[PDB]
Amino acid sequence: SEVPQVVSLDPTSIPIEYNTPIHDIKVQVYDIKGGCNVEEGLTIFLVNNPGKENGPVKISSKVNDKQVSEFLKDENMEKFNVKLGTSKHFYMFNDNKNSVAVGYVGCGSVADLSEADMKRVVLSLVTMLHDNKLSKLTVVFEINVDKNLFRFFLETLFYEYMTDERFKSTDKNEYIKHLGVYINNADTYKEEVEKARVYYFGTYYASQLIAAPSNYCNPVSLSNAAVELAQKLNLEYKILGVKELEELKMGAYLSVGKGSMYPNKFIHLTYKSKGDVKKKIALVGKGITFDSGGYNLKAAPGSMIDLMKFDMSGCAAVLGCAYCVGTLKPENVEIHFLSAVCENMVSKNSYRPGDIITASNGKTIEVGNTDAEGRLTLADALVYAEKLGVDYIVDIATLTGAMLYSLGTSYAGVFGNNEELINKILQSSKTSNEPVWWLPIINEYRATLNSKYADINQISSSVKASSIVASLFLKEFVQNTAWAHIDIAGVSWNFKARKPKGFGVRLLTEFVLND
Amino acid sequence: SEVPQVVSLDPTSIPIEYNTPIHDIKVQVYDIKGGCNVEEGLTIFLVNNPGKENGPVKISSKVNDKQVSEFLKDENMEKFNVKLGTSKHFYMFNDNKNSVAVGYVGCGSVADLSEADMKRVVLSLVTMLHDNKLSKLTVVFEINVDKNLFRFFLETLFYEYMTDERFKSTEYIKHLGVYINNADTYKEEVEKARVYYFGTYYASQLIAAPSNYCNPVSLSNAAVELAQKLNLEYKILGVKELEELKMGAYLSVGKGSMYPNKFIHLTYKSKGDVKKKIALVGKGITFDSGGYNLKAAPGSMIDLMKFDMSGCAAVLGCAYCVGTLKPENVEIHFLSAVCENMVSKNSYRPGDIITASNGKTIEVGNTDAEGRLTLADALVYAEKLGVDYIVDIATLTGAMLYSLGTSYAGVFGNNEELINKILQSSKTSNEPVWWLPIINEYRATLNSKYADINQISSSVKASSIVASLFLKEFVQNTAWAHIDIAGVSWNFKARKPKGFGVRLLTEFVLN
Amino acid sequence: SEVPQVVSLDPTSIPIEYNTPIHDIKVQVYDIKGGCNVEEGLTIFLVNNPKENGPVKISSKVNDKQVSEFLKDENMEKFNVKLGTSKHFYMFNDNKNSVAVGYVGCGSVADLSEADMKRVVLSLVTMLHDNKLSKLTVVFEINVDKNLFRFFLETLFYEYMTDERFKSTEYIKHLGVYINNADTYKEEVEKARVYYFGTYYASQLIAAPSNYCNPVSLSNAAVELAQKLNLEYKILGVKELEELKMGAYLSVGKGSMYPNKFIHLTYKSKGDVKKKIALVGKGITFDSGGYNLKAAPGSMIDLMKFDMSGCAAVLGCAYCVGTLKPENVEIHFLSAVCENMVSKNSYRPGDIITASNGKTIEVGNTDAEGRLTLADALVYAEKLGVDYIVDIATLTGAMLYSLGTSYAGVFGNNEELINKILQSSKTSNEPVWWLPIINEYRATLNSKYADINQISSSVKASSIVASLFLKEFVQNTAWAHIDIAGVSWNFKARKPKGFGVRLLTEFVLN
Numbered sequence A: 001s002e003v004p005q006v007v008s009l010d011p012t013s014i015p016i017e018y019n020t021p022i023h024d025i026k027v028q029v030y031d032i033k034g035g036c037n038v039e040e041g042l043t044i045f046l047v048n049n050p051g052k053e054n055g056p057v058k059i060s061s062k063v064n065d066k067q068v069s070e071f072l073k074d075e076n077m078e079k080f081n082v083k084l085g086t087s088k089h090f091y092m093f094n095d096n097k098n099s100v101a102v103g104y105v106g107c108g109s110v111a112d113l114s115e116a117d118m119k120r121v122v123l124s125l126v127t128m129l130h131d132n133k134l135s136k137l138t139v140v141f142e143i144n145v146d147k148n149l150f151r152f153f154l155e156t157l158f159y160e161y162m163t164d165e166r167f168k169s170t171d172k173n174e175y176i177k178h179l180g181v182y183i184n185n186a187d188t189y190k191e192e193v194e195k196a197r198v199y200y201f202g203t204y205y206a207s208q209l210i211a212a213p214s215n216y217c218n219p220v221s222l223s224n225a226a227v228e229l230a231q232k233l234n235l236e237y238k239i240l241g242v243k244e245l246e247e248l249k250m251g252a253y254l255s256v257g258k259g260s261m262y263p264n265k266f267i268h269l270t271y272k273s274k275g276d277v278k279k280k281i282a283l284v285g286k287g288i289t290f291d292s293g294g295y296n297l298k299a300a301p302g303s304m305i306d307l308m309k310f311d312m313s314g315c316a317a318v319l320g321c322a323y324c325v326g327t328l329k330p331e332n333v334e335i336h337f338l339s340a341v342c343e344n345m346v347s348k349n350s351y352r353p354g355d356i357i358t359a360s361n362g363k364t365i366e367v368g369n370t371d372a373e374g375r376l377t378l379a380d381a382l383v384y385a386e387k388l389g390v391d392y393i394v395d396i397a398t399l400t401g402a403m404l405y406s407l408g409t410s411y412a413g414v415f416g417n418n419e420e421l422i423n424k425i426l427q428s429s430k431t432s433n434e435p436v437w438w439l440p441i442i443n444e445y446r447a448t449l450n451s452k453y454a455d456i457n458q459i460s461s462s463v464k465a466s467s468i469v470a471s472l473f474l475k476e477f478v479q480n481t482a483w484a485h486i487d488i489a490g491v492s493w494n495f496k497a498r499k500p501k502g503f504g505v506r507l508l509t510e511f512v513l514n515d
Numbered sequence B: 001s002e003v004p005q006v007v008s009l010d011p012t013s014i015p016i017e018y019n020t021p022i023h024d025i026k027v028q029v030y031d032i033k034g035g036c037n038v039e040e041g042l043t044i045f046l047v048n049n050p051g052k053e054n055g056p057v058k059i060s061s062k063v064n065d066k067q068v069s070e071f072l073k074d075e076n077m078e079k080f081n082v083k084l085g086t087s088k089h090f091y092m093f094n095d096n097k098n099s100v101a102v103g104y105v106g107c108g109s110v111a112d113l114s115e116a117d118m119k120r121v122v123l124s125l126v127t128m129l130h131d132n133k134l135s136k137l138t139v140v141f142e143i144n145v146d147k148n149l150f151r152f153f154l155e156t157l158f159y160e161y162m163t164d165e166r167f168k169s170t171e172y173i174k175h176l177g178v179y180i181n182n183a184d185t186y187k188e189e190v191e192k193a194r195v196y197y198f199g200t201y202y203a204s205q206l207i208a209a210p211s212n213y214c215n216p217v218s219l220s221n222a223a224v225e226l227a228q229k230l231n232l233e234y235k236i237l238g239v240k241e242l243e244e245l246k247m248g249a250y251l252s253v254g255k256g257s258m259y260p261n262k263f264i265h266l267t268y269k270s271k272g273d274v275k276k277k278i279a280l281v282g283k284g285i286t287f288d289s290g291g292y293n294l295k296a297a298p299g300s301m302i303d304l305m306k307f308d309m310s311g312c313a314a315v316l317g318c319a320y321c322v323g324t325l326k327p328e329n330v331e332i333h334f335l336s337a338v339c340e341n342m343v344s345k346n347s348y349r350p351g352d353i354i355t356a357s358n359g360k361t362i363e364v365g366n367t368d369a370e371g372r373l374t375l376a377d378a379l380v381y382a383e384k385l386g387v388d389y390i391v392d393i394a395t396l397t398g399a400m401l402y403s404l405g406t407s408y409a410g411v412f413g414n415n416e417e418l419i420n421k422i423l424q425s426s427k428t429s430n431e432p433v434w435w436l437p438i439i440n441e442y443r444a445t446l447n448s449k450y451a452d453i454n455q456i457s458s459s460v461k462a463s464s465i466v467a468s469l470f471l472k473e474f475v476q477n478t479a480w481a482h483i484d485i486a487g488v489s490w491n492f493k494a495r496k497p498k499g500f501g502v503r504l505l506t507e508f509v510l511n
Numbered sequence C: 001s002e003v004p005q006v007v008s009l010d011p012t013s014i015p016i017e018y019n020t021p022i023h024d025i026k027v028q029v030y031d032i033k034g035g036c037n038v039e040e041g042l043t044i045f046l047v048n049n050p051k052e053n054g055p056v057k058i059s060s061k062v063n064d065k066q067v068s069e070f071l072k073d074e075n076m077e078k079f080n081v082k083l084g085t086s087k088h089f090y091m092f093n094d095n096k097n098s099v100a101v102g103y104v105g106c107g108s109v110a111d112l113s114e115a116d117m118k119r120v121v122l123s124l125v126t127m128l129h130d131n132k133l134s135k136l137t138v139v140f141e142i143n144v145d146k147n148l149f150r151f152f153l154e155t156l157f158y159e160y161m162t163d164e165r166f167k168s169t170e171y172i173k174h175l176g177v178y179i180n181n182a183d184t185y186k187e188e189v190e191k192a193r194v195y196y197f198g199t200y201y202a203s204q205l206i207a208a209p210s211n212y213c214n215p216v217s218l219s220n221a222a223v224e225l226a227q228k229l230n231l232e233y234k235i236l237g238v239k240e241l242e243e244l245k246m247g248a249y250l251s252v253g254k255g256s257m258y259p260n261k262f263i264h265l266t267y268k269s270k271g272d273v274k275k276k277i278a279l280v281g282k283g284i285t286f287d288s289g290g291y292n293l294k295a296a297p298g299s300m301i302d303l304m305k306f307d308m309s310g311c312a313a314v315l316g317c318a319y320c321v322g323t324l325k326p327e328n329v330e331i332h333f334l335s336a337v338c339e340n341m342v343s344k345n346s347y348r349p350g351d352i353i354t355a356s357n358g359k360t361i362e363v364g365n366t367d368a369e370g371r372l373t374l375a376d377a378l379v380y381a382e383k384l385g386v387d388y389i390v391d392i393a394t395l396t397g398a399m400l401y402s403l404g405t406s407y408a409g410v411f412g413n414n415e416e417l418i419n420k421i422l423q424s425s426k427t428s429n430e431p432v433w434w435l436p437i438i439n440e441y442r443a444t445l446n447s448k449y450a451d452i453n454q455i456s457s458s459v460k461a462s463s464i465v466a467s468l469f470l471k472e473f474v475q476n477t478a479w480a481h482i483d484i485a486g487v488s489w490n491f492k493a494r495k496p497k498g499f500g501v502r503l504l505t506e507f508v509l510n
């Protein structure tokens, strides 16, 4: 579709980098039991010291170089400790009279690294990659990691190493071309390499969409990006416009976008396996391209209206999952990637606080607050999802700011109507190392959504547990299907690092794959 | 006339039910001095006990049933008391060996029940109707009530009994019996109560109706339909006509709305010599966002602001009653400058200087004080009609909640006699109103440096008075009274409108 | 009796000025008929034009040719009568003596209101403050009744007077009045002087900072005043207050370094008493709001020395009553005085306390301390067996949103008493508007654990809710309540009005 402009300078597409520097890195995996070769670039050892905290550095691996081995001997390394995050640079000449660069990153004293500890290690490693024109990196694992944590290492490395310069003009300014990995039982880890590279881009793709400003990323331009992505992955796609949405009676969703200059666009991507189907899955993401709050404008102190381009993070995660799925191509499964995309703006055309609107399932809704627009969009999307006749419906959304008060910035919350699906989401959490916590849908609060005139209240008057109340509202639009709700309002944006996380991509993909 | 839409799913008319289940209730009034008979349905005795606070229940009236009488002996009822709001249900077999349902509502210990108390009696009575599949209700009055309070009982019964389900997707009684002393005089109050009931309930339907349904176009269409179902003269002034009349203050407010301004002018004329011409003016803001002075502050309650046309709803509800009852020797003008206060590129700005139809220039200090601007141009219009009385009713100021609260509306004005008539009408209609002053000392704070007058005050925080001072500037030589119903229009506890003003304005017109 | 100190530099008494320069002003009142003489000082004509912003015209005959020439229509039409506008010129008279002549515009409306007359006086006083005059002469070319005339003199005296007790690093001696029917107005002159000081005495107490005016020193002041006027007096200390079981009032004062002090002054007539009145004044020397601290924007904690304006008004009334000495009445001047502070000893939000009438009270907001002190004061008052009880208090900030800064609110349980107040408002020219005690709001004060709530959680009609509360503490006596929170302090002029002295005095005398 054509993107409407106010001025000719208004951008008419989202800039997207497909071919990243990371994709050009050749990755080699070796077994430690054959010894380490130390040559060009930077060679880093991941070292810990179990039990003794801040203990001295010891190098276990055999180094196939007499000079370097002498340098890395215990007597020399004892002056350094393994405090998690610590790093050191070494400079020396090898057996062939060439200058080599060696070093280590401390992995603390705990034998089992959490997904957070791993991130801290990688961030230390990225520091060594930044402001250094290296042609090759070599990593030597002298720590115990399982296959999932190893993959997570690579993904995190690839993600943090990458730098988004899509909107830089006058302020720019060499990535490595080779990445060597030494690890015990290397043959058992090689399979994770390309999985990591695929999970990397799915996450980085979502990141680009979330980071892109609302004048670049609007409902028309975003849906366009989905079409382009589907075309590149040979996914079936359907983009529903206003005329189709009207006949489908999506009144709740249509109301939210009334005050926007950009018409509503409902994204429907489908991946179907070439084998007989055993499971049908619907993935629904909240896709508000900008959330101004509507007439309930985000004007209160700490409402953070400048962050509100983030409000399509759920849609981004789902599209990123679409990349991972359409690339890895899982068998015997059919997936629907769905998003009701629109923009919540203030206008003469906007919907009002107090308005009564009718969702596609016939339920009438009294809007008590226009800044609770996400559940309204999701309502019509959930009805759409169930109509597809699937086994699982999973939605992911930056729905409630209360999540920052419940689980904070590290853990997402999962709600649902089916315990087994919840457990499946939680298993996907562990294998993707994207932390999620199970929160209740307390039915005692349901009565507060009883409207005097409408079928149901959008919001509660009394209950301050908005994350739970919102889940109660969504559950009203899934009649008889296993359904889960993931709230990523707290974890989607990395506040200290000033960038998106692309949270949800790897989690949803593990869910699809391990089922 | 055609309602503009953004999407096809947008409503283009206000759903209105005219024939309610309350209209299907056959009402009979008997005199108690002949006996009560029971039989079918539920029979409720309104009882009290003068003197003793929680004194025993004593059924004094004669019951035309040996069984029911034996059950209603003093000794049997002695265990019950008459605490205001107390209710009980009884089961027994009458002389016909048929199961009958009997009970009572406690009417306290005071000989003269108050408006607030009578509503408490009714609500307790309505509770008995909501959870039971009854085909008939019988109410026996063993308390003293005058004709007005009796009518009030019926109105309040009818109002609280009726349930609005216009906006829901996913068994009323058919008979009402009333036993009462001096029944023949109370009989005429019945159909008057039915008329007062709907005028009130018509108003509430409009107010309760959300702002996507009730817009300046649909509301004015509803008024035309009402005018046509009665036979009042009607004319809806459009933007073009309003421009020719130079109603700039009124036109400014609606600038940011997707709905064109509609000025409602209804007229009732008696078929005889007119001795009094009256102009009723209702504030008709279908939705009040506040304009660029957006309602964002804690406690501004923006999601309620569909009620900001309660003044118009009150005026239309009165038009129905007047249209139905057809009073004599009067000519009534039902006026409302309807528009919507929205945020847009076309909206008017704080600081803007606008020109009223009487030529006075106005400096806008706050866009959320928009009611008095539409009223100003409506008052100019009303006085040009050459009337004897101008009365406006409006949800104008939030300060009312801090002055009089949620029960008592405030009345302002430039003529004591007119105020006295409004206060009198407040008594007989049982819609409480308290007289508040227009303090002229505060007028100096409406002096502008550039415009002829300021919209809002600089220093004074008594906005309900300051607003009254602003309104008075647009009535040069006609008795005028102002009724602020911003405090009383919405029943917060019940989460519904009161339809406040309909009965007051009708009592004012009739008498 | 002895005022406690934290440091030796802390004040131990309220400075009071009794003999003011106003008392040194010799006032003569002449009839306009016969013409006006202009010989010394300033002569101001009070002129109107019944049109708007119309020209100035002097109707009165001036027995001086030079001034007459200055006052001819051709000269005066250059000026206008816009309410409060003034001009004055210096010139020589027939005797070649320096005189000053001018006018104050009185607008275009024939009957001046109390607000209008104040703007006129303020324009008059402006000329007084920047001219070294020996004599002011005011010629009334407007119509004023006896009451408005006396009100003119009181307001003139009050605005003219400058309080300088707290300043560290030449009033006129003669006042002349030309007015039609001068004889009927002369008797109002000395009454004005009395009403002025009663108002000024009160203002002196309100303006006095909270470190000067504390529970102890304020009660000490009341005794000093009571002795000068030969009124009997009684100051109740904490021990008495404890034996009287005044828990509501004692609770509020718990966090203060200053012990609670209950002021009880009594005026008795030599003639057989036929009416007994008790006047109750809110006496909070400082109101920080307690643990419910006044910390919200616009809570104006720096004003809160005014929170004893009610007590000041009562004492101001006591001066007038003791001076004019009315007959056949016994008046009781009451005030439960204390301070509302934050401390380890303070009363907390939530506390349930017992008033002297046995009613348990759940404290929902420590800043609503006024009604608690008033509760035990009203209980004390009824025990005196009086016919009328009138309390006057800076009780609710909501008054600023109802009536504003000019009209005080009056509540009550007896229609005749309220009307007597409303009439006193008319004759004292201190504006008061009747407000309703809505019984339908009473149910919000039903405590879950106490007999009654201190405040309402829902209803925002604070003045009415507070009226319902106080109503619970008067069982069988005519009682009226005057909320002067909005009108007590003159914000524009940055000073007290001493509001209520003249109102209550007119109530006692008439």
Ligand SMILES: Nc1cccc(C(=O)N[C@@H](C(=O)NO)c2ccc(-n3cccn3)cc2)c1
Pocket: A291, A303, A304, A369, A371, A372, A373, A374, A398, A399, A400, A401, A402, A404, A459, A466, A489, A490
């Ligand atoms: N009680 C009540 C009332 C109205 C809105 C909410 C609410 O949860 N609002 C959310 C919203 O705007 N959804 O569209 C909302 C608000 C803030 C964030 N946020 C996340 C990170 C930083 N801020 C996320 C979602 C709740």
Ligand SMILES: Nc1cccc(C(=O)N[C@@H](C(=O)NO)c2ccc(-n3cccn3)cc2)c1
Pocket: B288, B300, B301, B366, B368, B369, B370, B371, B395, B396, B397, B398, B399, B401, B456, B457, B463, B486, B487
């Ligand atoms: N001084 C000044 C400044 C700006 C607004 C007002 C003012 O009176 N605003 C009113 C308004 O919006 N009129 O259109 C207003 C405000 C609130 C309510 N309210 C009623 C129930 C709950 N709230 C009603 C009317 C006055």
Ligand SMILES: Nc1cccc(C(=O)N[C@@H](C(=O)NO)c2ccc(-n3cccn3)cc2)c1
Pocket: C287, C289, C299, C300, C365, C367, C368, C369, C370, C394, C395, C396, C397, C398, C455, C456, C462, C485, C486
């Ligand atoms: N419900 C409830 C809660 C908390 C305070 C009040 C209240 O009315 N408080 C009054 C008080 O502090 N009394 O001691 C009070 C009295 C006067 C003002 N005022 C402001 C400016 C001029 N005067 C403000 C508050 C009521």
Ligand SMILES: [Zn+2]
Pocket: A291, A293, A370, A371, A372, A373, A374
């Ligand atoms: Zn929102």
Ligand SMILES: [Zn+2]
Pocket: A288, A291, A311, A371, A373, A374, A398, A399
């Ligand atoms: Zn949102």
Ligand SMILES: [Zn+2]
Pocket: B288, B290, B367, B368, B369, B370, B371
């Ligand atoms: Zn408004």
Ligand SMILES: [Zn+2]
Pocket: B285, B288, B308, B368, B370, B371, B395, B396
């Ligand atoms: Zn309004």
Ligand SMILES: [Zn+2]
Pocket: C287, C289, C366, C367, C368, C369, C370
């Ligand atoms: Zn206080």
Ligand SMILES: [Zn+2]
Pocket: C284, C287, C307, C367, C369, C370, C394, C395
């Ligand atoms: Zn106080």
